[PDB]
Each structure stands twice: as C-alpha cells, then as structure tokens.
Design an enzyme around this catalytic site. Structure first.
Site, PDB file in Angstrom:
ATOM      1  N   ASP A  80       0.820  -1.533   0.195  1.00 50.67           N
ATOM      2  CA  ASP A  80      -0.189  -0.020   0.070  1.00 50.67           C
ATOM      3  C   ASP A  80       0.919   1.309  -0.016  1.00 50.67           C
ATOM      4  OD1 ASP A  80      -2.324   0.646  -0.177  1.00 50.67           O
ATOM      5  OD2 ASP A  80      -2.580   1.065   2.095  1.00 50.67           O
ATOM      6  N   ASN A 112       0.688   7.499   2.818  1.00 55.78           N
ATOM      7  CA  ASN A 112       1.264   6.093   4.345  1.00 55.78           C
ATOM      8  C   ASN A 112       2.564   6.533   4.280  1.00 55.78           C
ATOM      9  OD1 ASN A 112      -1.022   5.959   4.861  1.00 55.78           O
ATOM     10  ND2 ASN A 112      -0.933   3.887   4.058  1.00 55.78           N
ATOM     11  N   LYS A 133       2.062   4.675  -0.658  1.00 55.90           N
ATOM     12  CA  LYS A 133       1.425   5.821  -1.300  1.00 55.90           C
ATOM     13  C   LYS A 133       1.629   7.240  -0.816  1.00 55.90           C
ATOM     14  CE  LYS A 133      -3.091   4.757   1.366  1.00 55.90           C
ATOM     15  NZ  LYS A 133      -3.988   5.080   0.909  1.00 55.90           N
TER      16      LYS A 133
END
Ligand SMILES: Clc1c[nH]c2ncnc(N3CCc4[nH]cnc4C3)c12
Ligand SMILES: [Mn+2]
Lengths: 10, 319
Positions: B131, B136, B133
């Site tokens: 994840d 984050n 991105k």
C-alpha cells in the site's frame, strides 16, 4: 493537489 | 506495564473509520510519541483483526531507519494501542498538495530512502508492503522518510512467492493485481513508480475519479512523460511502471538491487542512505515537539468476543 485516497481490502 | 494513564493526549493527528492517532507525551520520560488507538469492537465488526495483528508483528520485528519504530503495544478492556515514533514532518501527501512537484533531487532522496526500507522488508523480513502511497509516507523531524501503516502487508513472502488478496489503494494498484493474477513482491516497485511519478510530474500516471475507469487506464494506456522530465527519470519511471511485473525494474531475483543500480540513482551511495548521512532536502520547520503545522487542520483543530482479549498483543522495546 489530488483528493485523498482510501486503502481497501476485499 | 503500560495503560492509557501513562500518557497525556495532546493533539489529534489522524482519524479514519477504524481509529485514530494522537500526539502523546509519556509521563515517566517526558518523551513524545504518536499513539494509534483502535477500538476493539470496531476492529472486530469491520473485519480488521488480521490486519491489526499483521501490523503489530511487522512493527515488532522491524528495525530500520525509515520504518516507524514501535515503543509499546498494549491493550485495555476496549482498546488496542501502538506507541510509535512521532513523525513531526507530516505526510508527503501534505507537502506535495502544496508544492505541486518535487525537484528530481528531492524525489531522488525520498525514493532512495523508500527503496532502502522496501529492500529491508523484502530481504530481511520477507514482507511485501502493498500500500505504498503519498498518504502513508511521512517525514520525521530531520526530514527523513518514515513508513507507517503496515496493516496491508503480506508476511512470509520469500523470494518470488505469490499472493492473491485484492487490497491496496485503487489509484496505486499494479496491473497484475487488476488482472486477478497471482502477484509477487514486484507490486511494491509499481507503487514506487507511481509515488516517484507523482513526485516528479505532479499528478498520478493514471487518473479517473471512478475506480473502474481508472483500472482500465492502468491495464491499457502507456504513461505520459512531461517534457521537463530528464532522461534518467524518464527511464526509471518507465522501468518501474512496466505493466508486466516480469519486465519491471526490480521484478527479477535481484529485487531492489536492480533499482539501486539504475542510472537515476547514480552517485547515491546506498550505505550512506541507510546510515542517514545524506542531507535531507527539506527540514521540517517546527517551533516545539507539539507543533503540528504539517498535519491537516481537520484533525489537529479537534479537541480530545465482541471485545476479545488479544493473546500476547502486549510488547515493550528495549536496548
Ligand atoms: Cl501511525 C504513526 C506513527 N508515527 C506517526 N507520526 C505521525 N503521524 C502518524 N499517523 C497520523 C498521520 C498518518 N498518515 C498516514 N498514516 C498516519 C499515522 C504516525
Ligand atoms: Mn479514490
């Protein structure tokens, strides 16, 4: 300046 | 031996559907941390238990200068809490929403730190992050990368072993995930490419508000390359955003070592990256340890079996 995304799990 | 009582709660840093993160100060030390607080009942209802245990293990087991270090994990009768290093510089999403693009050198610096962390997760920890991105990827007080949010990680992925879960964030999903193929740790280099593209081009390589039409762009179209982009950056983006993971930069047995070799990163010295000897192109300008000017106003401006025991969730770092 894009919108905030949302993490997902199916 | 840690409870809600051991800390003061100062500023809300984040709040989504499962929980919230608060800037806290530990009473016995005077030290400041970020505490992610989850309500057990909501985690059980929203089906986030296995994600939370993954995040607990990944944090406990990881030791790396660009991964958020875990200080305590502890539970109460209704809460799970992680107490982690506070990243004082906020999200890359914050910075890039205000500046539009980073210079190639600034993007290169963050990219190298990201590659260092990802390489460690893959190689040392057998973890695929899934994840990556802008939201984050945080910056600490010196302006180095801190990866947060390990809940979508896959564990026990050794070399080119594959996985099946449809998870991540829509705008960042690699083609092989959308094809409903088994997929390997190279999904994280696709993410890297999307992050690096946004950093240097100031938009997502594939964009449509509607997740479904977006997916079509990801499988079907070639990325565009703004004419300001240098030849090295172009080649890096093109390699990381190859649609076939077997053809992708980082997609072979060498994993990160192939990206590290790439001419965009020429004269990055990887051991200095790890040892934090490279000069951050941006230092967060904070007054105090509680200055949250790099966080979103929506949150900081706010005033502060159904509930099972989680076996051996509790953890305390030391030396
Ligand atoms: Cl979790 C966490 C560990 N350390 C942090 N320092 C600042 N903020 C944090 N959070 C609040 C904003 C944000 N954005 C994406 N993930 C997070 C989590 C955290
Ligand atoms: Mn979206």
């Amino acid at each position: 300046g894009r919108p905030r995304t949302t993490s997902f799990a199916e | 031996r840690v409870t809600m009582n051991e800390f003061e709660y100062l500023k809300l840093l984040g709040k989504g559907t499962f929980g919230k993160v608060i800037l806290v100060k530990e009473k016995a030390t005077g030290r400041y941390y970020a505490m992610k607080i989850l309500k057990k009942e909501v985690i059980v209802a929203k089906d986030e238990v296995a994600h939370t245990l993954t995040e607990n293990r990944v944090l406990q087991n990881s030791r790396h200068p660009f991964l958020t270090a875990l200080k305590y994990s502890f539970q109460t009768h209704d809460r799970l809490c992680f107490v982690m290093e506070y990243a004082n510089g906020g999200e890359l999403f914050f910075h890039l929403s205000r500046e539009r693009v980073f210079s190639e050198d600034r993007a290169r610096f963050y990219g190298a730190e990201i590659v260092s962390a990802l390489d460690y997760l893959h190689s040392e920890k057998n973890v695929v992050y899934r994840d990556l991105k802008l939201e984050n990827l945080m910056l600490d007080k010196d302006g180095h990368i801190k990866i947060t949010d390990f809940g979508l990680c896959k564990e026990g992925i050794k070399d080119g072993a594959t996985m099946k879960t449809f998870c991540g964030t829509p705008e960042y999903l690699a083609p092989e995930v959308l094809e409903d193929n088994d997929y390997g740790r190279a999904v994280d280099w696709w993410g890297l490419g999307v992050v690096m593209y946004e950093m240097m081009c100031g938009r997502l390589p594939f964009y449509n508000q509607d997740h479904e039409k977006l997916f079509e762009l990801i499988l079907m179209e070639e990325i565009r390359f703004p004419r300001t982009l240098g030849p090295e950056a172009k080649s890096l983006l093109s390699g990381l955003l190859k649609k076939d993971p077997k053809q992708r930069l980082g997609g072979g047995s060498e994993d990160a070592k192939e990206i590290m070799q790439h001419r965009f990163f020429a004269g990055i010295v990887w051991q200095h990256v790890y040892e934090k000897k490279l000069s951050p192109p941006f230092k967060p300008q904070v007054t105090s340890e509680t200055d949250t000017r790099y966080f979103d106003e929506e949150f900081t401006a706010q005033m502060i079996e159904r509930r099972p025991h989680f076996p051996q969730f509790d953890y305390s770092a030391s030396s």
